[PDB]
RNA sequence: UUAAUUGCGAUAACGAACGAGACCUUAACCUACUAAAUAGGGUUGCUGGCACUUGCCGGUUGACUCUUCUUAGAGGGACUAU
């Protein structure tokens, strides 16, 4: 007997976007075909991670500078959900790049 | 561990760089071409695209085995957490890195530079890519520095599609007189480019309209009524 | 429920969110009477739409504007835009098309950004200088 | 005179009948006349405003700079010296004070006074760098009306600042007295003095 | 012979995009809904006070792209708007708030047809489909049968055909150069009317409903019998057309030609008037062309909409 | 400073040559036509193509032109 | 003619390639969509003060509801359009 509502909460992470977006699409499609109550795939400010460096390794030349960056997207979600179907959902449909974390909200 | 998400992502990136430089250092003689890191909740698999798959595999699959332990020894991963997979490259012609390593190896044997480079570019054209370039700089048979370019087809230099299609590799070759820089640029065919745009930005494809005969002017028609 | 609509106005960062209801001529920005905007000289500007149309235009209306961001002049201009946009939105939605028409005519007939947002927005600073289009200095010798 | 009840009580002078837009609720643009027939259409007294500060796009196009209210151009040109480049609030307060002073000195509703001062101090002839290297000369050239307006504003504000520098007298009042001198032909004004000097140099080098 | 000449009375303005469609509520005389490229449906009250014939009432914001066709409800309280923002919108004409947003097309929508009385919704769209919606928002039927964009679907009026039929017939057209009329309950295909040498842009049935007219680029107007299932006549406008509207009482046909408006007396098969109003500063090639037409219930007033963002009223007064 | 370089003009000219009966004086309609009937990567290029096609439609309506 | 070897064209030149553009990031516009206690808002509880007329200004992981504002995806929007 594992009927207790779990309030399970997922949080995604991805350097890129489309993999994260399709992962979220898969998670929501699985939850809805499983008849679950969800708080939608909320959108969080994609944290830009910036580093500005000098191009020249020696400092000679006109001052020229460049800005590398990533843009990380988190977009957590959360379900009012039982265990076994949901934990199985968590352990399925992961592609590389996207990192998934689960907290039970115990 | 309890580590900020941004810090963890940077750590994953620098770990990716770890493995990439590792494989370039060691597996070069076996024809290393690229690395990928895929993670399941269970294990973190490392997928190693190489030219000569068996030599990377080694005798009776021993070689792969040792590499795994090195990783688990170097990066403190527990036994069985990470496994290694060897696959043949889809096609060695397209992967510029394999071509550049082939260049370096063929020079190591002391081959004709122009002959070797033209063999490489001909192989690239044979592989179906729509443009190749190989650049060699250094002490070409002399003391004064030189830099000759050997190109065919055509290559685009500017515009974000440069990253979208054109693969590029650079290698240093150790000859008795010093170091020779080789740069390989391969412009992948947009038609067969997965995971990205299927054509160049300015490639306009007009579609042929199907034709019909217009003589049927009056042509009263009737269907049977349907519920 | 009470006919009520919500609008916004901006100035480069400053955002004024205005909620307008069918009330009794209640005009508060940040929960304070509109007479008390600190610029004190830009003060007439916060009145500025009203005097164009005449406050009698909103005697059965109440406006509350919460405003954040920006500096001060930006804040005041955002408040102005919020007020004008709220008047226009309410009158268009519940009163009549022609009413909104003379309101738009009066607003646009004076300091066009009073109704329309200003798109004039700062751009990033390139390297090599103190400003986006400034260079440090050169020696030559 | 017809006050309207609301939940918030707008003060007397602001709420009474003010569909008669005034500069600072004090001075009216009506009755303001442009003497010289040229500089009309180059001063925007036709447009009534309630503050002398309206941040609009008045410099992107070739000639929209003329649509600026004249008082705002004066304000924006008060702030010189580099250090005080911004702080428009300071400039608008100074100009408001100066309008009050002009209201004191010769009641004549001040906007007419400042417009007349602008008209008078414009140099109708200028000089130009023409002499080539060796036999340098000073050529006499006619001037643009818009340039006359802009030049008048610049010389007025320059005179005001130079009068106020390290001086007990304040910028507002120094500007006011310069405007008073410039409404007439009072050569005590620095602005008209420089205008005369420029006119004379142009004339002597016809 | 038939000395009845209509004259313009005034103009209706307020749209900032082309007057794409008009629609008159049967029950209410002075009500007129007009859609524009400005994405804003304007409801007009007709006033007999002065030169302005009609006066706006409510503007219906809620459309992000072009509004193409407009249809009013039977009572005069709802109106359906077809838009290029990939949706349909149903509006209450008193409050002014849309309550239904019909979603599901892939090519942007072009045409709307109201039910006979109230129950169903008929929409045409570039996605080569015709959608039969309910009043709340769900799509019940997805009619297929056109390879190209369907330009317009209009419900065939049911005058007296049988007392009761339990069936609602309508018509559809597009660039397939074939006109497919349909029946609705259940609600399946029926006959094709292949007549057009160049593609059709507008079809609008006669007020009785047994007759319909189609026209397009070629300038040929094919007028057709619905129940009799026979081609009636083939006029030619000698010019590209935009809209055709049947007059209610007269046996007439207004047509929105590229140059002006051609009125045909169908019984005599002869045109009786051209509409070419005056504009200033238009060098004979930038003449705004009519793209919306509407005949009021009496049939004595015509409402037209050009690209000049103008809606004109043509009062049909007798010239003795 | 807009002059609409070779690619837009050539693609447009082809579109006229192939579909003149299917083009109109309008931009929006011609925009959707060119989007549907040809594959254009970036929508800015598609808008430019539609604009040139509309200009050519207006030119033809005024009078036949070379090329 | 354009900012452009950018085009109109004229043409012992013809067709092609790079560069420019095209392209990507960002900035702006989306009362259209998708949603949101890690962002907000309305109503409504329970409370604090004042005016006492039911009005304001407040507080409050209470309840309900909403997404204009804040987010970020899909997209829409301009191409010199008229
Ligand atoms: Mg290029
Ligand atoms: Mg600076
Ligand atoms: Mg570029
Ligand atoms: Mg929003």
E192: nearest Cα among E200, E113, E254? E200
**Which ligand gives the minimal distance to the CA of A43?**
4
Q: Identify the residues numbered 37 to 56 in chain A whose C-beta atom is closer than 7 Å to any atom of strand G.
A: 38-46
Q: Are chains F and D in contact at 3+ CB pairs closer than 8 Å?
A: no
Which candidate from E186, E197, E231 shows the least CB-CB separation from B227? E186
User: If you measure from the C-alpha of residue C135 to the centroid of ligand 2, how many angstroms do you get, rounded to a whole number?
Assistant: 10
- The single residue listed with the structure tokens 């309950």 is E185
Query: Nearest CA to CA, how far is E83 from chain F (Å)?
Result: 13
Residue C46 domain boundaries: 1-141
Give the pair of three-digit tokens for residue D79: 């702030």
Is there a domain that residue F66 lies in?
no
Can you tell me the distance from the alpha carbon of E256 to that of E312, in angstroms, rounded to the nearest whole number? 13
- Closest Cα in chain C to A52: C127
Q: Does F63 touch chain E (CB under 8 A)?
A: no
Question: What residues make up the domain containing F34?
Answer: 1-61
Scanning every strand, the nucleotide with its C1' closest to E61's CA turns out to be G31
Distance CA F11, CA F42 (A): 14
E window 56-95: Cβ near strand G (< 7 A): 61-65, 84-85, 87
The answer to whether B196 contacts chain F (CB < 8 Å) is: no
Output the CA angle E67-E68-E73, nearest 5 degrees: 90
Minimal Cβ distance to C98: which of E55, E61, E96: E55
Query: For chain E, which residues make up each domain, given as ranges?
Result: 9-320
- How many Cβ atoms are within 10 Å of C141's Cβ, its own excluded? 3
CATH of the domain at C53: 3.30.230.10
Q: What residues sit around ligand 2, an ion, with C-beta below 5 angstroms?
A: C 130-131
Class of domain E9-320: mainly beta
Chain E within 8 Å of F32 (Cβ-Cβ)?
yes
Assign 3-class secondary structure to chain E: CCCCCCEEEEEEECCCCCEEEEEECCCCCCEEEEEECCCCEEEEEECCCCCCCEEEEEEECCCCCCEEEEEECCCCCEEEEEECCCEEEEEECCCCCEEEEEECCCCCEEEEEECCCCCCEEEEECCCCEEEECCCCCEEEEECCCCCCEEEEEECCCCCCCCCCCCEEEEEEECCCCEEEEEECCCCEEEEECCCCCCEEEEEECCCCCEEEEEECCCEEEEEECCCCEEEEEEECCCCEEEEEECCCCCEEEEEECCCEEEEECCCCEEEEEECCCCCCCCCCCCCCCCEEEECCCCCEEEEECCCCEEEEEECCCCC
CB E31 within 8 A of CB E25: yes
Q: Domain count of chain A?
A: 1
Both tokens assigned to A74: 């988190």
Q: Do A15 and B9 touch (CB under 8 A)?
A: yes
Q: In this structure, is residue F43 part of a structural domain?
A: yes
3+ Cβ–Cβ pairs closer than 8 Å linking E and A: no
In whole angstroms, G75 C1' to E104 CA is 14
Per the CB < 8 A criterion, the answer to whether E171 and E205 are in contact is yes
Residue F32, in any domain of the structure:
yes
- What chain B holds in terms of domains, given with CATH numbers, is 1-90 (3.30.300.20), 91-223 (3.30.1140.32)
- Strand, coil or helix: what is D156? helix
Question: Residue C97 in contact with residue E42, Cβ under 8 Å?
Answer: yes
Contact E14 C101 (CB under 8 A): yes
Instruction: Report chain G positions within 7 A of protein CB atoms.
Output: 1-4, 6-9, 17-24, 26-38, 41-42, 55-58, 68-82
Determine the 3-state secondary structure of B110 from DSSP.
coil
Residues pairing with E293 in the sheet = E304
Helices (DSSP H) in B27-112: which residue ranges? 53-57, 62-74, 96-108
Question: Domains in chain D and their CATH numbers?
Answer: 1-206 (1.10.455.10)
User: Cα(first)–Cα(last) distance of chain E, in Å?
Assistant: 11
Torsion angle, alpha carbons of D182, D187, D192, D196, to 10: 150
Q: Interhelix angle for C43-53 vs C97-108, to 10°?
A: 130
- Data resolution in angstroms: 3.8
Please enumerate residues of C whose Cβ is less than 8 A from a Cβ of A.
Answer: 127-128
Q: How many separate domains does chain C show?
A: 1
CB of B196 nearer than 7 A to strand G: no
In C, what residues contact D, Cβ < 8 A?
Answer: 23-28, 33-35, 39, 41-42, 44-45, 47-48, 51, 54-56, 58-59, 62, 73, 77, 111-113, 118, 120
* Closest residue by Cα to residue B73 from B120, B36, B22, B5: B22
Distance between CA atoms of residues C98 and C112, nearest Å: 19
Rounded distance between C-alpha atoms, residue E36 and residue E23, angstroms: 12
CATH at residue A57: 3.30.70.600
Interface A-B: count of C-beta contacts within 8 A: 27
Distance D138 CA to ligand 2 centre (A): 37
Instruction: Report CA torsion sign: B51, B56, B57, B59.
Output: positive
Chain breaks in chain B (C to N over 2.5 A) after: none
Nearest protein residue by Cα to C1' of nucleotide G29: C119
Residues of E in contact with B220 (CB under 8 A): 193-195, 229-231
Residue F19: which CATH number?
1.10.60.20
């Amino acid at each position: 007997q594992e009927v207790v509502i779990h309030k399970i909460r997922i949080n995604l992470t991805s350097t890129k976007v489309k993999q994260l977006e399709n992962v979220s699409a898969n998670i929501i499609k699985n939850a809805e075909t499983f008849k679950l109550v969800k708080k939608g795939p909320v959108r969080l400010p994609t944290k830009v991670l910036k580093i500005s460096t000098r191009k020249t390794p020696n400092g000679e030349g006109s001052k020229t500078w460049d800005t590398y960056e990533m843009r990380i997207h988190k977009r957590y979600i959360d379900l009012e959900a039982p265990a076994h179907i949901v934990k199985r959902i968590t352990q399925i449909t992961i592609e590389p790049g996207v990192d998934v974390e689960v907290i039970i909200a115990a | 561990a309890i580590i900020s998400k941004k810090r963890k992502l940077v750590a994953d990136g620098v770990f990716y760089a770890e493995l990439n430089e590792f494989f370039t250092r060691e597996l070069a003689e076996e024809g290393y071409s690229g690395v990928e890191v895929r993670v399941t909740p269970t294990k973190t698999e490392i997928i190693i695209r190489a030219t000569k798959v068996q030599d990377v595999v080694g005798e009776n699959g021993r070689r792969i085995n040792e590499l795994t332990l090195l990783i688990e020894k170097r990066f403190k991963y527990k036994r069985g957490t990470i496994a290694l997979y060897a696959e043949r490259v889809h096609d060695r012609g397209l992967s510029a890195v394999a071509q550049a390593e082939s260049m370096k190896f063929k020079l190591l044997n002391g081959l004709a530079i122009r002959r070797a480079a033209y063999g490489v570019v001909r192989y690239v054209m044979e592989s179906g890519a729509k443009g190749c370039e190989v650049v060699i700089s250094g002490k070409l048979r002399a003391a004064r520095a030189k830099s000759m370019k050997f190109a065919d087809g055509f290559l685009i230099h500017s515009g974000q599609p440069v990253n979208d299609f054109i693969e590029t590799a650079t290698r240093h070759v150790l000859l008795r007189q010093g170091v020779l820089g080789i740069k390989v640029k391969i412009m992948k065919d947009p038609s067969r480019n997965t995971s990205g745009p299927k054509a160049l930005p300015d490639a306009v494809t007009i579609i042929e309209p199907k034709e019909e005969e217009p003589v049927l002017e009056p042509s009263v028609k009737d269907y049977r009524p349907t519920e | 429920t009470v006919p009520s609509v919500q609008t916004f106005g901006k100035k480069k960062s400053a955002t004024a969110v205005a909620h307008v209801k069918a009330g009794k001529g209640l005009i508060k920005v940040n929960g304070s009477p509109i007479t008390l905007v600190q610029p004190e000289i830009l003060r007439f500007k916060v009145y500025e739409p009203l005097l164009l149309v005449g406050l009698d235009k909103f005697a059965n209306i109440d406006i509350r504007v919460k405003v954040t961001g920006g500096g001060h002049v930006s804040q005041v201009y955002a408040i102005r835009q919020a007020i004008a946009k709220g008047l226009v939105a309410y009158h268009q939605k519940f009163v009549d098309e022609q009413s909104k028409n003379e309101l738009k005519k009066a607003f646009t007939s004076y300091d066009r950004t009073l109704l329309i947002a200003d798109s004039r927005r700062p751009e990033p600073k390139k390297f090599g200088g103190r400003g986006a289009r400034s260079r440090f200095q050169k020696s030559y010798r | 005179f017809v006050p309207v009840e609301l939940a918030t009580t707008i003060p007397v002078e602001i709420q009474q009948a003010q569909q008669e837009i005034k500069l600072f609720n004090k001075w009216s643009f009506e009755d303001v006349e442009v003497k010289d027939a040229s500089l009309v259409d180059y001063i925007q007294i036709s447009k009534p405003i309630y503050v002398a500060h309206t941040a609009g796009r008045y410099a992107n196009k070739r000639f929209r700079k003329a649509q600026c209210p004249i008082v705002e151009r004066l304000t924006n040109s008060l702030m010189m010296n580099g250090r005080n480049n911004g702080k428009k609030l300071k400039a608008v307060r100074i100009v408001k004070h100066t309008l009050e002073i002009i209201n004191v000195l010769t009641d004549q509703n001040p906007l007419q006074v400042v417009v007349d001062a602008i008209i008078n101090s414009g140099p109708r002839e200028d000089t130009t760098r023409v002499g080539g290297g060796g036999a340098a000369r000073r050529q006499a050239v006619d001037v643009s009306p818009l340039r006359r307006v802009n030049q008048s504003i610049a010389l007025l504000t320059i005179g005001a600042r130079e009068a106020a520098f390290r001086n007990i007298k304040t910028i507002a009042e120094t500007l006011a007295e310069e405007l008073i001198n410039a409404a007439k032909g009072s050569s005590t004004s620095y602005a008209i003095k420089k205008k005369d000097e420029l006119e004379r140099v142009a004339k002597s080098n016809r | 012979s038939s000395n009845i000449m209509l004259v313009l009375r005034g103009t209706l303005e307020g749209h900032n995009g082309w007057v794409t469609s008009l629609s008159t509520s049967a029950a209410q005389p002075n009500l007129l809904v007009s859609g524009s490229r400005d994405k804003t449906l304007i409801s007009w009250r007709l006033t007999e006070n002065e030169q302005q014939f009609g006066v706006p009432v409510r503007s219906y914001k809620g459309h992000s792209h072009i509004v193409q066709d407009v249809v009013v409800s039977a009572d005069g309280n709802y109106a359906v708007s077809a838009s290029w923002d990939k949706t349909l919108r149903l509006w209450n004409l008193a409050t002014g708030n849309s309550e239904a947003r019909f979603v599901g097309h892939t090519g942007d929508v072009l045409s709307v047809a109201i039910d006979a009385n109230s129950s169903k919704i008929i929409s045409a769209s570039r996605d080569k489909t015709i959608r039969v919606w309910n009043t709340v928002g769900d799509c019940a039927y997805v009619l297929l049968g056109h390879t190209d964009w369907v330009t317009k679907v209009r419900v065939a009026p049911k005058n007296l055909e049988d007392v009761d039929d339990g069936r609602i017939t309508f018509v559809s057209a597009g660039m397939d150069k074939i006109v497919r009329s349909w029946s609705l309950n259940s609600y399946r295909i029926e006959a094709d009317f292949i007549g057009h040498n160049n593609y059709i842009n507008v079809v609008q049935p006669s007020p009785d409903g047994s007759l319909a007219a189609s026209a397009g680029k070629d300038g040929q107007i094919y007028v057709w019998n619905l129940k009799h299932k026979s081609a009636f006549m083939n006029f030619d406008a000698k010019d590209e057309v935009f809209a055709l509207a049947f007059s209610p009482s007269r046996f007439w046909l207004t047509a929105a030609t590229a140059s002006g408006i051609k009125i045909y007396d169908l019984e005599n098969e002869v045109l009786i008037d051209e509409l070419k109003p005056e504009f200033a500063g238009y060098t004979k090639a930038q003449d705004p062309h009519a793209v919306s037409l509407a005949w009021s219930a009496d049939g004595q007033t015509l409402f037209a909409g050009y690209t000049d963002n103008v809606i004109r009223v043509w009062q049909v007064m007798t010239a003795n | 400073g807009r002059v609409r370089t070779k690619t837009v003009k050539r693609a447009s000219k082809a579109l006229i040559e192939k579909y003149y009966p299917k083009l109109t004086m309008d931009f929006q309609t011609n925009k959707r036509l060119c989007d549907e009937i040809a594959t254009i990567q970036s929508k800015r290029l598609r808008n430019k193509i539609a604009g040139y096609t509309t200009h050519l439609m207006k030119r033809i309506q005024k009078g036949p032109v070379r090329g």
